[PDB]
Design a protein around this motif. Structure first.
Motif, PDB file in Angstrom:
ATOM      1  N   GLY A  23       7.175   3.281   8.982  1.00 20.95           N
ATOM      2  CA  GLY A  23       7.605   3.860   7.723  1.00 20.95           C
ATOM      3  C   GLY A  23       7.342   3.004   6.504  1.00 20.95           C
ATOM      4  O   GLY A  23       7.998   3.192   5.477  1.00 20.95           O
ATOM      5  N   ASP A  24       6.382   2.080   6.578  1.00 17.26           N
ATOM      6  CA  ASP A  24       6.088   1.159   5.480  1.00 17.26           C
ATOM      7  C   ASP A  24       5.003   1.789   4.615  1.00 17.26           C
ATOM      8  O   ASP A  24       3.811   1.537   4.776  1.00 17.26           O
ATOM      9  N   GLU A  25       5.431   2.637   3.678  1.00 16.37           N
ATOM     10  CA  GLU A  25       4.465   3.381   2.876  1.00 16.37           C
ATOM     11  C   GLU A  25       3.589   2.440   2.053  1.00 16.37           C
ATOM     12  O   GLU A  25       2.359   2.573   2.043  1.00 16.37           O
ATOM     13  N   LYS A  26       4.205   1.476   1.363  1.00 14.30           N
ATOM     14  CA  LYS A  26       3.437   0.560   0.519  1.00 14.30           C
ATOM     15  C   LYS A  26       2.416  -0.207   1.341  1.00 14.30           C
ATOM     16  O   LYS A  26       1.221  -0.196   1.032  1.00 14.30           O
ATOM     17  N   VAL A  57      -2.932  -1.568   3.274  1.00  7.51           N
ATOM     18  CA  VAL A  57      -3.810  -1.938   4.380  1.00  7.51           C
ATOM     19  C   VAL A  57      -4.927  -0.912   4.536  1.00  7.51           C
ATOM     20  O   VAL A  57      -6.089  -1.271   4.771  1.00  7.51           O
ATOM     21  N   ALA A  58      -4.612   0.373   4.360  1.00  8.12           N
ATOM     22  CA  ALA A  58      -5.663   1.381   4.431  1.00  8.12           C
ATOM     23  C   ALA A  58      -6.744   1.113   3.391  1.00  8.12           C
ATOM     24  O   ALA A  58      -7.944   1.235   3.684  1.00  8.12           O
ATOM     25  N   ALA A  59      -6.343   0.722   2.180  1.00  9.49           N
ATOM     26  CA  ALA A  59      -7.325   0.431   1.140  1.00  9.49           C
ATOM     27  C   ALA A  59      -8.259  -0.697   1.559  1.00  9.49           C
ATOM     28  O   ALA A  59      -9.469  -0.632   1.313  1.00  9.49           O
ATOM     29  N   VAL A  60      -7.718  -1.736   2.202  1.00 13.11           N
ATOM     30  CA  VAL A  60      -8.546  -2.879   2.590  1.00 13.11           C
ATOM     31  C   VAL A  60      -9.548  -2.473   3.662  1.00 13.11           C
ATOM     32  O   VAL A  60     -10.710  -2.895   3.643  1.00 13.11           O
ATOM     33  N   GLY A  67     -15.271   4.663   2.383  1.00 11.13           N
ATOM     34  CA  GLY A  67     -14.985   3.759   1.287  1.00 11.13           C
ATOM     35  C   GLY A  67     -14.051   4.324   0.242  1.00 11.13           C
ATOM     36  O   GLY A  67     -14.109   3.900  -0.920  1.00 11.13           O
ATOM     37  N   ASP A  68     -13.191   5.271   0.619  1.00 14.47           N
ATOM     38  CA  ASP A  68     -12.278   5.938  -0.309  1.00 14.47           C
ATOM     39  C   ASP A  68     -10.936   5.225  -0.239  1.00 14.47           C
ATOM     40  O   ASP A  68     -10.062   5.578   0.551  1.00 14.47           O
ATOM     41  N   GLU A  69     -10.770   4.207  -1.089  1.00 15.02           N
ATOM     42  CA  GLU A  69      -9.543   3.414  -1.081  1.00 15.02           C
ATOM     43  C   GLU A  69      -8.354   4.232  -1.568  1.00 15.02           C
ATOM     44  O   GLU A  69      -7.272   4.189  -0.972  1.00 15.02           O
ATOM     45  N   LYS A  70      -8.529   4.970  -2.666  1.00 11.48           N
ATOM     46  CA  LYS A  70      -7.433   5.787  -3.170  1.00 11.48           C
ATOM     47  C   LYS A  70      -7.129   6.934  -2.216  1.00 11.48           C
ATOM     48  O   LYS A  70      -5.960   7.251  -1.971  1.00 11.48           O
ATOM     49  N   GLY A  71      -8.164   7.550  -1.646  1.00 15.21           N
ATOM     50  CA  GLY A  71      -7.928   8.588  -0.656  1.00 15.21           C
ATOM     51  C   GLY A  71      -7.252   8.056   0.590  1.00 15.21           C
ATOM     52  O   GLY A  71      -6.257   8.616   1.060  1.00 15.21           O
ATOM     53  N   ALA A  72      -7.778   6.960   1.144  1.00 15.61           N
ATOM     54  CA  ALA A  72      -7.181   6.402   2.353  1.00 15.61           C
ATOM     55  C   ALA A  72      -5.735   5.994   2.114  1.00 15.61           C
ATOM     56  O   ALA A  72      -4.858   6.278   2.937  1.00 15.61           O
ATOM     57  N   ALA A  73      -5.466   5.344   0.980  1.00 19.19           N
ATOM     58  CA  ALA A  73      -4.102   4.920   0.673  1.00 19.19           C
ATOM     59  C   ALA A  73      -3.147   6.108   0.635  1.00 19.19           C
ATOM     60  O   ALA A  73      -2.020   6.023   1.131  1.00 19.19           O
ATOM     61  N   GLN A  74      -3.589   7.232   0.065  1.00 19.60           N
ATOM     62  CA  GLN A  74      -2.733   8.412  -0.044  1.00 19.60           C
ATOM     63  C   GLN A  74      -2.360   8.967   1.327  1.00 19.60           C
ATOM     64  O   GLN A  74      -1.209   9.367   1.552  1.00 19.60           O
ATOM     65  N   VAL A  75      -3.320   9.017   2.252  1.00 20.27           N
ATOM     66  CA  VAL A  75      -3.050   9.595   3.568  1.00 20.27           C
ATOM     67  C   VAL A  75      -2.211   8.646   4.406  1.00 20.27           C
ATOM     68  O   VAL A  75      -1.311   9.076   5.140  1.00 20.27           O
ATOM     69  N   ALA A  76      -2.502   7.345   4.321  1.00 19.08           N
ATOM     70  CA  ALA A  76      -1.720   6.350   5.043  1.00 19.08           C
ATOM     71  C   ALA A  76      -0.250   6.442   4.665  1.00 19.08           C
ATOM     72  O   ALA A  76       0.629   6.374   5.533  1.00 19.08           O
ATOM     73  N   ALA A  77       0.032   6.626   3.372  1.00 27.02           N
ATOM     74  CA  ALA A  77       1.415   6.703   2.911  1.00 27.02           C
ATOM     75  C   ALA A  77       2.099   7.958   3.430  1.00 27.02           C
ATOM     76  O   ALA A  77       3.246   7.902   3.886  1.00 27.02           O
ATOM     77  N   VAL A  78       1.411   9.103   3.359  1.00 28.01           N
ATOM     78  CA  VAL A  78       1.981  10.346   3.866  1.00 28.01           C
ATOM     79  C   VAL A  78       2.291  10.218   5.347  1.00 28.01           C
ATOM     80  O   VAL A  78       3.366  10.614   5.807  1.00 28.01           O
ATOM     81  N   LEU A  79       1.373   9.626   6.111  1.00 28.54           N
ATOM     82  CA  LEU A  79       1.638   9.425   7.531  1.00 28.54           C
ATOM     83  C   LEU A  79       2.816   8.483   7.738  1.00 28.54           C
ATOM     84  O   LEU A  79       3.662   8.725   8.611  1.00 28.54           O
TER      85      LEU A  79
END
Lengths: 43, 48
Positions: free
Chosen positions: A19-22, A27-30, B24-36
């Protein structure tokens, strides 16, 4: 002997499960920076 | 393969996350990671 990519991917899986949204978002961005080819499957 | 009628929400999100990271979609990947993360989804993320 684990790669940086491996540890990042594992961080992302653990962040999402915990549940660590931030952290999951950062990490996804990296991983996206390195344009890593990953398999993301459900458990 | 699952046709789109045989995919769940989490399955679609997991695939969006893989595609976003691989493109290479950092903003896209970040958005989906957070929703998950908000649903504390149990995921396997594997180096391919």
């Amino acid at each position: 002997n684990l790669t940086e990519r491996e540890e990042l991917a594992g961080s992302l899986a653990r962040a999402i499960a915990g549940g660590d949204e931030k952290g999951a978002a950062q990490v996804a961005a990296v991983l996206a920076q390195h344009r890593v080819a990953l398999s993301v499957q459900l458990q």
